[PDB]
């Protein structure tokens, strides 16, 4: 449904690709989306201790799945089960990440 | 989940990205599909009148939804629930299409 693809060979790991789903989840455009780190989407509440284990696994290419509070556009708070998974080329070398994006809201 | 992307300005719309779900729900490597049209995963049991759906959706430029048997690398056949979404860059103009696979 929420998902995305970022682009770790360009400067602070861009988003390139963005579903509609992710689109509505978030209430934010592709248009203003393309081009920036998803870090935007963290917010007052988020705990920086998650941060710091996707900022760790980003670092390690390790795939990962984590819980984090997140904000919509408009500042709407919930809760994000975030998955993440590198992609690499055939010489291996790091190409892409993913990330999957689940509202735990009920 | 199990995703795609494909690039329906190159030649015969291959897929140009999948999921770590969509290669284990198939079986096959990234290196086996990446440039291939997703046909490739049709067989004698596919209903040709669904193919023709998901072409005229493509050839409309519109999201569609549907069912239709497939078969993993080693010949296994699964129905695959797809759901299929055009995706336009900023000018409007046809970028890419992504699919969402779902095994039932
Ligand atoms: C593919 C991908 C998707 C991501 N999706 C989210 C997300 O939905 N929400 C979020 O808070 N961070 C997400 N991130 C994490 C941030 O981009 C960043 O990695 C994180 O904030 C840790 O880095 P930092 O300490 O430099 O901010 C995602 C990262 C990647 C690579
Ligand atoms: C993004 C995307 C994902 C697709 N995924 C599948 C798939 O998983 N299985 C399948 O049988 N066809 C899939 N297709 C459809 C085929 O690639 C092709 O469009 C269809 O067979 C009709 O074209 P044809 O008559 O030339 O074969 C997908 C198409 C697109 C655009």
Redo the contacts with the bound molecule.
Sequence with gaps: KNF???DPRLPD?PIIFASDGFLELTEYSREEILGR???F??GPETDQAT?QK??DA?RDQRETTVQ?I?YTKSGKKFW?L?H?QPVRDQKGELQY???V?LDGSD
């Design positions: 995305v693809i970022t790991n780190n998803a870090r989407l963290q941060v996707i900022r980003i984090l997140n994000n975030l993440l990440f993913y990330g994006q």
